[PDB]
């Protein structure tokens, strides 16, 4: 078996073994990426996503989200309470403001220290989940835009038709910025592209050991886990890497830079956080064995975790005992 430890692995394609993107991904899964939950892809130095990013000011973030913790440093909610629209270049000069600003540091572990220890007594304000591209229409390798859809690939192996669309997603942070434990809608797999500015660092847990987060999930979070049956897929809860070294649990880190891609493997969990300002693009695919995946995924009914569209397909020819139930979540 290969990566039998689950290390998260780290890939050099060549300009030509970057041509063929789900050639790549099924390479990475002979040596074992999968098994981590996550891999980084550093694309070839011939390569670039566009020619430059000074002209990026005028995009609206239409709704900023101020997250708000609650609970200790280590365990701990957060909630996203909606802020007035602003541009880019107006979110940029609030994320180096002296109030939002990364605090003086020595390396990424003194940062991810800092972290840590005072993420609940600071709200930040992240432009997550903003449709659009940062990829040049040009840049024909590793496009996020161009990839094959996941209705189209959930066709080729069922052979069934479905409705939905599938497009990528921008992301704007700024210091202590917080992605919550999750996985993919569906168990589906990620691909994401740090565009630029400051780092990204990112937490996983291996597939294989996901329902042990679970487990201590449930203990830590216990009316969340009494009101719903999956509530890590509202994406609001967080664990430190000290609780969960406390508890035993599996994991990984790794800090991505601008440049780098991250693919997230199905039924990884991962959670994270932006060192200063940032701007990523994210979307989701599929492959083959994805279909077992989204077979068994679990679902949110309670109703707080509420997606998109095309999640209804999804759920509706992978899991009909779960549609109905599912679908008044939904409604
Ligand atoms: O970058 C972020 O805030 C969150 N991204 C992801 O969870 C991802 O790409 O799967
Ligand atoms: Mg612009
Ligand atoms: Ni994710
Ligand atoms: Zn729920």
């Known amino acids: 078996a290969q990566n039998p430890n689950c290390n998260i692995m780290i890939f050099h394609p060549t300009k030509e073994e970057f041509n063929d993107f789900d050639k790549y991904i099924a390479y990475m899964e002979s040596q074992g990426a999968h098994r981590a939950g996550l891999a980084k892809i550093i694309p070839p130095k011939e390569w670039k996503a566009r020619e430059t990013y000074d002209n990026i000011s005028e995009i609206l973030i239409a709704t900023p989200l101020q997250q708000v913790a609650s609970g200790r440093a280590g365990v701990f909610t957060q909630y996203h309470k909606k802020k007035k629209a602003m541009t880019v270049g107006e979110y940029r000069h609030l994320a180096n403001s002296k109030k939002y600003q990364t605090p003086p540091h020595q390396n990424f572990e003194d940062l991810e220290r800092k972290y840590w220890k005072n993420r609940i007594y600071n709200s930040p ?3 997550a989940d903003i449709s659009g591209s940062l990829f040049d229409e040009n840049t024909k390798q590793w496009n996020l835009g161009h990839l094959g859809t996941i209705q189209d ?13 599938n497009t990528p997603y921008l992301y704007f942070g700024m ?6 434990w999750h996985t993919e809608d569906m168990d589906l797999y990620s691909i994401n592209y740090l565009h630029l500015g400051e780092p990204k660092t990112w937490y996983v847990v291996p597939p294989e050991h996901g329902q042990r987060l679970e487990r201590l999930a449930r203990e830590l979070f216990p009316g969340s886990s009494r009101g719903c049956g ?3 897929r509202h994406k609001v809860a967080l664990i430190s890497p000290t609780v969960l070294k406390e508890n035993g649990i599996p994991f990984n880190r790794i800090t991505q830079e601008a440049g780098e891609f991250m693919v997230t493997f199905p039924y990884g969990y991962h959670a994270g956080f932006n060192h200063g300002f940032n701007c990523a693009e994210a979307i989701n695919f599929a492959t083959p064995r994805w279909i077992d995946y989204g077979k068994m995924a679990s679902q949110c009914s309670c109703g707080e975790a509420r997606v998109t569209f095309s999640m209804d397909a999804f759920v509706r020819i992978l899991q009909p005992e779960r549609y109905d139930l599912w679908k008044r979540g939904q409604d």
């Open 230 to 232: 999956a509530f890590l």
């Open 175 to 180: 210091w202590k910025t917080t992605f919550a």
């Open 125 to 127: 304000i992240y432009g």
């Open 153 to 165: 690939l959930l066709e080729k192996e069922c052979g069934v038709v479905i409705e939905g669309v």
